[PDB]
Design a protein around this ligand. Structure first.
Ligand code: CLA
Ligand code: CLA
Ligand code: CLA
Ligand code: CLA
Ligand code: CLA
Ligand code: CLA
Ligand code: CLA
Ligand SMILES: CCCCCCCCCCCCCCCC(=O)OC[C@H](COP(=O)(O)OC[C@@H](O)CO)OC(=O)CCCCCCCCCCCCCCC
Ligand SMILES: CC1=C(/C=C/C(C)=C/C=C/C(C)=C\C=C/C=C(C)\C=C\C=C(C)\C=C\C2=C(C)C[C@H](O)CC2(C)C)C(C)(C)C[C@@H](O)C1
Ligand SMILES: CC1=C(/C=C/C(C)=C/C=CC(/C)=C/C=C/C=C(C)/C=C/C=C(C)/C=C/C2=C(C)CCCC2(C)C)C(C)(C)CCC1
Ligand SMILES: CC1=C(C/C=C(\C)CCC[C@H](C)CCC[C@H](C)CCCC(C)C)C(=O)c2ccccc2C1=O
Ligand code: SF4
Ligand code: SF4
Ligand SMILES: [Cl-]
Lengths: 69, 73, 143, 80, 73, 141, 40, 750
């Protein structure tokens, strides 16, 4: 029940953004475990040692989110 | 002079051991469903605040103690 | 009562009165040593000739700790409050990180010059609810 | 020998296999992601554990995990 | 005595801080949320994610040993 | 597999090659065809000249073979994608390793089995208090 | 031009200008009124 | 920018007209030189990586023609910096010193060229050096240089500072010009034959030529009067000597003949100022300037002649390509083939040679200045002697490790295996294990047979067994070779050097020259305590060479990592696998070699400082006897580790800790401060970032609790940066401790 541009809070525990709130980028069709692709304002840890930043996007599931807006 | 320092070093190893084995309890023996919502699990629920305030008080100490020693010198 | 019996004022202390006649000069003023002899002669001293400060909370020595404590806390709250407010102000402008690396001087100065009322602003943000956050809305790690 | 697992959070981008320097990892057709593939670890006997796969993972936290174990001549990277 | 007591207080607060962050974050964190699956003592996790040197709950004990020795000095 | 045909590369010998344990315990060989005669760096040290056509070289361990393979296709315009890595036993037993099913492990391929595949998230691993005293790990179950 | 006005307002230039200004303040204050272990 | 005409005359000059325009918009954009950093900071690490790659021009751009044009202007900017610094010294000597007050009575006053602003009690740092002047006693030996150069008035030093600032402006301008107006092409650079011709004939030849001319017209005729007993105000000016060439013709008998004999091959007549006396000056304790002018003239002729060996445009001359392609024997196959192309393309290949040679030559400078003091009254100033020696030791020690760094950089970035097929470099890459294991064995041998001797001596003297020690009073370890060459240099003026009147240095053997009440230089008797410390030095240098060599011979690959060349020059590891791949890169090898260079020089400078105070330096009695400071215990106490712990450290450190309340209190402060920074480095060197990032997580939660977290997400230092900060603070604290200790100790010996 999501669309492009919704504010959702991550509830994936092990996620780097667990507790943070990101923006939905695009949702893929059915047949995928994690179709909800979310962008974030803050990069994660990803990257080799000494990297400049990280990744600010990831796929999640609907039972792992919570709309805010 | 020897006995006091001896016992103090003994205790200084004993305390580090007490903490190293608590870490092992968390690693191997902590049950989150058995100790659910008790005083032990709430320690894990607000661990960020505990560590943060420990860092604050250690900075608040170190800064001024070192500053006063350097000032006296 | 006779609080600090082992401490005598610098005006009565033996070693302090011996050393005060032979005080060095910090600045260019040659009287600065005798200036110290006259200035520190009011504090409590020890049997070695060096002044001591009592910080247990008594008002007799409120000039020893109370005044610097208050003056610091004022200036430090000023610093932290203007920093926090400017950090929040950046969060709505273009590129929240570039303006943290390159300072918006016309904005940073405008926020610095409005910091002498940081206690009132902080209480107004706490009553309205802007000072602190909610635990259920902060990114936390697995327990 | 080391243990290599691949979780359902994998998007099948072959990056961990493109970074593996001992042909430990492969790619099998799956039905979970757009690419319809998931990482596989058939030849764990050649896994030294240099974590070059985990470094090259895109998902939020790893989708492939390496757990070091009983080191052997091949896992120790012994060339002599 | 006052200044050395505050240096001692620093030595206690910081050593306890290290030994407590090692025990609390012994099951997981945001760098390694699956630290519980790796056990207590393990080398690291690799150079990825920026770096993971001295990340186990054993490494925190190894670090706090230095602080205990400094406090006992 | 049946025969390891190939010409030894032009190289003046180095001390970084295989040793006594590498001949008695196990060694690795790689076979490839070169479009022409060019110079390539040795994974053990130095620069060698690969022969035109089918080549053959024996190395100590597998990572050396794969490091040479990743070099062959990336540095030269006539890229070598037919390099085949074999493990040699002390009994002459030679088996195929890389590439596995004739296709590079990078791209997907039909006819492979899911090895080490789990149907959960890492944050869904069981608690170590439930499996203690058993010879199993939170990831092995 | 603004290209140099942005360089003069960078983090290191400004964080050293403030430190120099505060050093001047403190040094002049402890020049005219030094030796203030406490408040009289 | 501007537009000059052309400035060429049938030359290999090749430039590009205004390649890089002049603008300030790139100044407000930090990290623009790197593509990975231009998109904006997302973590605090982005900041560190900004400085870690500020000067690395290879990662920035791949065009070598751009990198060379960057390097040229970078050198110009460095020269501007240097000229600014030197004008600083000349101006502080002109208006903030007592050079005039010292030149009058140089034996009853101390050099000082700094005045501390009296504030918050720091005015106590102005020590009474003599003559009414109050300031910091300097140890760089600037007054001795300015006396040997002919400086007599403050206006001279003032004009020197003005000229230095003018030259700084000129170098700064030339840098901008050779990158924004007319930047040279590659045709102007790759003429290594032409560049060597010009750098030998013009730079090092004409330089010493002109300086010898200066000395003959400035330094010699004024230092001759200074050494006689004439007041500086009564001594004429240097230009009064050329305005009146008769005053120069009279002051030297050879000058009373004219200039024609030199052109008519009558050199022997100029023996009245181009002398070969040798030894030292009994008035000042330094080298004879009449010998230095002759020496600079000889070096000038030699270098100008050397600048005519290589081929340029007129056909004659050599090509280094020919010489390298010619040298090939049955042992190395093709020999030096391809080396010209190596050193004409890779800048790192050139820097790995230039840094090595420059550091070695700085060490040679120290070792030659300490024993043959070339400046007046510097051998009496033990502080200045020690300071120059140790400073030129440290500069060279750093510049040497720079070579081992840039060699690995060349290996990873510029080594083309197709260009090195069976030559020196390629064949050396083959038997890497041979050389490395042999050096391993040599280092183990030198460790057992140099340090184990000290351990054995400590255990024997501790057990109460004197007849079982390696001392001058037991199992003697006399150095025969060094004593033999000492005796050779002593008998030089009467055998293998008939024209030489005195020996090169009095350290080998001979008379004992002393100025005022202190000694300048005397024979340095070499015994067991010298043999053992020399072998200690050899061992430490061998281990440092082993480390910095395995850093280059394995930057490409190894049995552990066969694809290491892909990982680059600077990288922390390749995972905890293979048992542990931590610190395998050449960067890590330089990180390790820094510590061993420090550990080697730590024993070198202590050997110097104790041997000089024990068997050389000391007050001289009017009857003739010489009583050394530590009473000559080096030959009898420096043989055990407890001797160095007690009679060297504990004994001579008393000046530093007891310095409170005096003008040397700053040295005790910096002593404790270096003790602080040393231990501060251990926090980085013993820990790992995985703990610090987890702690930053809690502090970030604390900041977000009050909503005060920076958009620049805080990230702990990278593994490489952690190690770099560790080694940097280690070296800083150690060198600050030793600097404070050495200065406080040397200033407190009279
Ligand atoms: C002399 C050596 C030294 C020093 C100074 C420190 C200092 C510190 N350690 Mg530490 N540590 C050391 C050795 C040292 N450690 C060693 C050998 C180990 C074993 C590897 C450890 C392991 C260790 C651990 C595991 C931890 C610490 C922590 C800390 C911090 C505690 C906060 C505090 O003390 O308050 C105040 C800070 C200070 C008194 C030090 C600051 C001093 C400077 C001079 C202040 C002024 C700043 C200066 C002007 C900057 C400008 C520089 C400019 C010139 C370029 C502190 C900064 C804990 C921490 O991170 O805190 C949360 C932590 O958990 N240490
Ligand atoms: C707007 C800036 C700002 C503000 C409001 C705070 C506020 C806070 N910090 Mg903090 N911090 C800052 C910057 C700031 N920090 C920076 C730049 C650093 C990197 C050096 C840190 C590193 C740091 C650590 C390690 C810790 C805190 C902690 C804390 C909390 C306890 C206060 C404290 O520890 O005493 C004083 C805080 C310090 C001594 C840290 C340095 C403070 C800097 C130097 C002042 C920043 C000035 C800033 C540039 C002003 C901008 C003005 C603007 C107009 C341009 C507190 C809410 C503690 C905590 O976790 O909470 C319990 C703690 O452990 N901070
Ligand atoms: C961090 C703890 C600390 C504290 C609380 C103080 C406090 C004080 N210092 Mg001090 N100082 C410190 C660290 C500290 N210092 C360090 C680390 C150094 C070494 C760089 C110094 C070096 C120093 C000097 C050289 C002097 C002081 C002086 C002073 C006093 C002057 C107050 C003043 O200027 O009036 C109020 C200021 C504005 C209203 C004051 C009580 C001055 C003094 O004479 O002491 C009495 C003075 O001369 N300090
Ligand atoms: C006012 C004169 C001026 C101006 C407007 C520019 C402008 C520019 N220069 Mg440039 N340059 C100048 C003078 C100038 N330069 C001089 C005098 C030199 C000789 C040293 C150079 C050598 C030079 C090189 C080699 C390069 C540039 C580049 C650039 C461009 C990017 C600069 C940058 O990264 O940000 C600004 C950088 C800084 C503000 C650096 C800060 C100063 C450092 C930290 C130390 C200062 C040393 C200084 C040169 C000498 C000291 C002076 C002495 C008194 C001690 C930019 C458009 C780069 C380019 O073209 O992009 C690819 C490039 O590679 N310049
Ligand atoms: C006789 C003519 C002559 C002279 C006097 C010099 C003098 C100098 N050259 Mg130079 N050079 C020359 C001809 C000459 N060159 C020619 C013909 C070429 C082309 C082949 C070069 C190409 C060249 C390069 C590439 C570089 C120099 C550099 C230098 C300076 C390095 C020495 C130094 O820094 O010490 C102290 C300086 C003053 C006391 C120096 C002042 C270096 C430099 O500083 O960059 C500007 C440098 O990198 N030169
Ligand atoms: C003329 C000599 C020379 C030259 C031209 C270069 C040039 C270069 N070196 Mg290099 N190097 C040299 C000598 C030289 N080096 C020596 C002698 C050593 C041995 C110590 C090294 C060791 C070395 C290493 C390990 C590395 C380089 C790297 C580099 C490249 C990037 C520079 C950089 O990181 O940006 C700017 C440099 C910095 C930001 C360093 C700042 C930190 C300094 C050291 C702090 C010093 C403090 C100060 C001097 C004193 C303390 C006072 C304090 C209280 C304020 C660059 C092309 C890097 C590379 O990747 O190569 C391609 C690399 O990692 N060098
Ligand atoms: C008192 C402390 C100590 C001692 C006793 C040693 C002893 C030794 N080190 Mg060592 N080292 C030390 C501190 C020490 N190190 C530290 C703090 C570092 C960090 C910079 C190093 C880094 C280091 C490196 C990188 C290497 C050594 C090597 C060696 C061995 C050289 C063989 C030899 O000396 O012959 C006889 C034995 C004893 C006299 C030797 C056993 C070298 C080696 O392995 O040998 C070839 C080697 O490469 N060390
Ligand atoms: C302190 C010394 C007093 C103790 C005596 C020690 C004797 C030293 C042994 C003789 C010198 C050996 C080198 C010449 C021998 C020599 O260079 O011959 C020349 C030979 C190659 O020459 P080519 O015939 O190829 O000549 C063509 C060249 O132009 C390049 O193509 O080089 C080698 O032998 C490679 C093997 C080097 C490995 C041997 C070196 C041993 C390392 C230790 C050296 C100690 C030197 C100490 C000096 C301070
Ligand atoms: C009586 C007194 C002392 C005794 C003092 C007592 C014992 C200390 C008590 C401390 C108590 C326990 C803590 C006090 C307050 C704790 C709350 C949580 C404070 C929170 C402050 C935060 C919310 C402020 C945040 C933002 C404030 C508003 C302004 C800053 O710019 C910036 C920034 C930091 C973001 C002694 C030591 C005995 C000596 C005696 O002479 C005087
Ligand atoms: C005033 C006084 C008094 C009182 C006192 C008191 C009562 C107090 C106290 C106190 C205390 C009492 C303190 C303490 C301490 C403690 C400790 C030191 C602890 C510990 C432990 C630990 C640290 C551990 C933890 C853990 C972990 C880590 C996790 C897991 C679990 C466990 C638990 C293992 C009287 C009147 C009597 C007398 C006079 C004086
Ligand atoms: C403490 C620590 C950190 C954390 C270190 C940090 C976060 C550096 C702190 C830097 C602060 C924010 C800046 C203060 C220092 C400035 C560079 C000084 C400049 C002062 C001028 C502005 C005057 C690591 O990242 C690390 C990594 C690997 C091994 C060991 C360690 C380690 O021990
Ligand atoms: S990089 Fe990780 S998530 Fe991507 S395909 Fe490989 S194992 Fe799966
Ligand atoms: S841990 Fe390293 S060697 Fe093992 S499969 Fe992953 S990338 Fe390959
Ligand atoms: Cl002894």
């Amino acid at each position: 029940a999501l669309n492009r541009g919704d504010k959702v809070r991550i509830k994936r525990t092990e996620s780097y953004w667990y507790g943070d709130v990101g923006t939905v980028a695009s949702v893929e069709k059915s047949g995928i475990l994690y179709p909800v692709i979310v962008r974030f304002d803050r990069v994660n840890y990803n990257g080799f040692s000494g990297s400049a930043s990280g990744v600010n996007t990831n796929n999640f599931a609907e039972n792992e989110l919570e709309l805010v807006q | 002079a020897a006995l006091y320092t001896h016992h103090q070093y003994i205790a200084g190893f004993l305390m580090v051991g007490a903490f190293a084995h608590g870490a092992i309890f968390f690693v191997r023996d902590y049950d989150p469903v058995a100790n659910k919502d008790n005083v032990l699990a709430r320690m894990l629920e607000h661990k960020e605040a505990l560590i943060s305030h420990l860092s604050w008080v250690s900075l608040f100490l170190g800064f001024h103690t070192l500053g006063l020693y350097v000032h006296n010198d | 009562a006779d609080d600090f019996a082992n401490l005598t004022p610098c005006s009565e202390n033996p070693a302090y009165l011996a050393k005060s006649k032979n005080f060095l000069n910090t600045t260019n003023d040659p009287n600065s040593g005798k200036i110290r002899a006259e200035r520190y002669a009011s504090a409590l001293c020890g049997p070695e000739g060096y002044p001591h400060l009592i910080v247990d909370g008594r008002f007799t020595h409120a000039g020893d700790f109370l005044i610097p404590s208050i003056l610091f806390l004022y200036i430090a709250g000023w610093i932290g409050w203007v920093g926090r407010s400017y950090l929040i102000e950046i969060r709505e402008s273009k590129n929240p990180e570039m303006q943290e690396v390159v300072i918006n001087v016309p904005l940073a100065i405008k926020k610095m010059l409005g910091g002498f009322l940081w206690p009132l602003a902080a209480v107004g943000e706490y009553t309205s609810g802007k000072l602190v956050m909610k635990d259920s809305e902060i990114p936390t790690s697995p327990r | 020998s080391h243990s290599v697992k691949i979780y359902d959070t994998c998007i099948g981008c072959t990056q961990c296999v493109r970074a593996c320097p001992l042909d430990v990892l492969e790619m099998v057709p799956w039905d979970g992601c757009k690419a319809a593939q998931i990482a596989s670890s058939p030849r764990t006997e050649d896994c030294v554990g240099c974590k070059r796969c985990e470094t090259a993972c895109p998902t939020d936290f790893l989708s492939i995990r390496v757990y070091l174990g009983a080191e052997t001549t091949r896992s120790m990277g012994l060339a002599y | 005595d006052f200044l050395v007591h505050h240096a001692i207080a620093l030595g206690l607060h910081t050593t306890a801080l290290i030994l407590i962050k090692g025990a609390l974050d012994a099951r997981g964190s945001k760098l390694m949320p699956d630290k519980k699956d790796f056990g207590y003592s393990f080398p690291c996790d690799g150079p990825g994610r920026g770096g993971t040197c001295d990340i186990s709950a054993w490494d925190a004990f190894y670090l706090a040993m230095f602080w205990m020795l400094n406090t006992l000095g | 597999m049946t025969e390891l045909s190939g010409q030894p590369p032009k190289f003046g010998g180095s001390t970084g090659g295989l040793l006594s344990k590498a001949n008695r315990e196990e060694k690795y060989a790689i076979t490839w065809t070169s479009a022409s005669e060019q110079v390539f760096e040795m994974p053990t040290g130095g620069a060698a000249i690969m022969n035109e056509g089918e080549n053959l070289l024996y190395l100590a361990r597998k990572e050396q073979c794969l490091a040479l393979g990743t070099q062959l296709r990336t540095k030269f315009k006539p890229k070598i994608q037919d390099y085949k890595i074999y493990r040699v036993y002390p009994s002459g037993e030679v088996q195929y390793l890389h590439p596995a099913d004739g296709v590079f492990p990078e791209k997907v391929n039909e006819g492979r089995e899911a090895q080490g595949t789990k149907t959960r998230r890492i944050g869904q691993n069981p608690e170590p208090v439930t499996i203690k005293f058993s010879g199993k790990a939170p990831y092995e179950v | 031009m603004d290209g140099l006005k942005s360089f003069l307002s960078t983090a290191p230039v400004m964080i050293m200008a403030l430190l120099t200004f505060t050093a001047g303040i403190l040094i002049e204050f402890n020049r005219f009124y030094p030796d203030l272990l406490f408040h009289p | 920018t501007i537009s000059p005409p052309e400035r060429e005359a049938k030359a290999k000059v090749s430039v590009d007209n205004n390649p890089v325009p002049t603008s300030f918009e790139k100044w407000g954009k930090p990290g623009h030189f790197d593509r990975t950093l231009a998109r904006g900071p997302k973590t605090t690490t982005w900041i560190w990586n900004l400085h870690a790659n500020a000067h690395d021009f290879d990662s920035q751009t791949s065009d070598l023609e751009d990198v060379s044009r960057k390097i040229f202007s970078a050198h110009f900017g460095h020269l501007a910096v240097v000229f600014v610094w030197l004008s600083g010294m000349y101006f502080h000597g002109a208006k903030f010193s007592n050079y005039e007050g010292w030149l009058a009575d140089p034996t009853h006053i101390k050099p000082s060229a700094q005045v501390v602003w009296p504030i918050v009690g720091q005015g106590i740092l102005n020590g009474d050096v003599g003559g009414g002047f109050h300031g910091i006693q300097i140890t760089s030996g600037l007054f001795y240089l300015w006396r040997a150069s002919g400086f007599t008035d403050s206006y001279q030093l003032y004009c020197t500072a003005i000229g230095g600032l003018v030259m700084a402006a000129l170098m700064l301008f030339a840098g901008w010009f050779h990158y924004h107006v007319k930047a040279p092409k590659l045709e102007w650079f790759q003429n290594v034959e032409s560049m060597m011709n010009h750098h030998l004939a013009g730079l090092l030849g004409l330089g010493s030529l002109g300086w010898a001319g200066h000395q003959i017209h400035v330094s010699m005729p004024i230092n001759k009067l200074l050494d006689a007993g004439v007041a500086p105000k009564d001594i004429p000016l240097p230009h009064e000597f050329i305005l009146e060439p008769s005053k120069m013709a009279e002051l030297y008998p050879s000058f009373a003949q004219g200039l024609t004999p030199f052109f008519t091959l009558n050199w022997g007549v100029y023996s009245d100022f181009l002398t070969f006396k040798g030894g030292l000056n009994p008035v000042t304790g330094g080298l004879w300037l009449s010998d230095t002018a002759h020496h600079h003239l000889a070096i000038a002729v030699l270098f100008i002649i050397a600048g005519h060996m290589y081929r340029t445009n007129w056909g004659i001359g050599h090509s280094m390509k020919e010489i390298l392609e010619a040298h090939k024997g049955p042992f190395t196959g093709e020999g030096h083939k391809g080396l010209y192309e190596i050193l004409t393309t890779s800048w790192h290949a050139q820097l790995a040679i230039n840094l090595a040679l420059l550091g070695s030559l700085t060490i040679i400078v120290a070792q030659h200045m300490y024993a043959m003091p070339p400046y007046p009254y510097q051998a009496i100033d033990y502080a200045t002697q020690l300071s120059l020696f140790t400073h030129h030791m440290w500069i060279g020690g750093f510049l040497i490790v720079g070579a081992g760094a840039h060699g690995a950089i060349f290996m990873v970035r510029d080594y083309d295996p197709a260009k090195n097929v069976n030559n020196l470099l390629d064949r050396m890459l083959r038997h890497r294990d041979a050389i490395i294991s042999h050096l391993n064995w040599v280092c183990i041998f030198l460790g057992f047979h140099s340090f184990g001797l000290y351990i054995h001596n400590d255990t024997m003297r501790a057990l109460g067994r004197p007849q079982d020690m390696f001392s001058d009073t037991a199992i003697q370890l006399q150095p025969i070779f060094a004593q033999w060459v000492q005796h050779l240099h002593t008998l030089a003026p009467g055998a293998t050097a008939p024209n030489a009147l005195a020996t090169a240095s009095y350290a080998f053997g001979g008379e004992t020259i002393a100025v005022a009440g202190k000694v300048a230089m005397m024979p340095i008797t070499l015994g067991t305590a010298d043999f053992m410390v020399h072998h200690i030095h050899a061992f430490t240098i061998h281990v440092t060479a082993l480390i910095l060599l395995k850093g280059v011979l394995y930057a490409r690959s190894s049995r552990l990592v066969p694809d290491k060349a892909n990982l680059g020059f600077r990288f922390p590891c390749d995972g905890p696998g293979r048992g542990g791949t931590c610190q395998v890169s050449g960067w890590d090898h330089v990180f390790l070699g820094l510590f061993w260079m420090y550990n080697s020089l730590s024993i070198v400078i202590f050997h110097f400082s104790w041997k000089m105070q024990s068997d050389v330096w000391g007050t001289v009695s009017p009857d003739g006897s010489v009583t050394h400071v530590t009473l000559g215990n080096f030959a009898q106490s420096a043989i055990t580790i407890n001797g160095w712990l007690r009679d060297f450290l504990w004994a001579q450190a008393a000046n530093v800790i007891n310095s409170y309340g005096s003008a040397l209190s700053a040295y005790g402060i910096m002593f404790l401060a270096g003790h602080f920074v040393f231990a501060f480095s251990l926090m980085f060197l013993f820990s790992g970032r995985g703990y610090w990032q987890e702690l930053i997580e809690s502090i970030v939660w604390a900041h977000n609790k009050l909503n005060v977290a920076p958009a620049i997400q805080p990230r702990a230092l990278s593994i490489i940066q952690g190690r770099a900060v560790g080694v940097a603070h280690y070296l800083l604290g150690g060198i600050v401790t030793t600097w404070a200790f050495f200065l406080a100790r040397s200033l407190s010996i009279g």
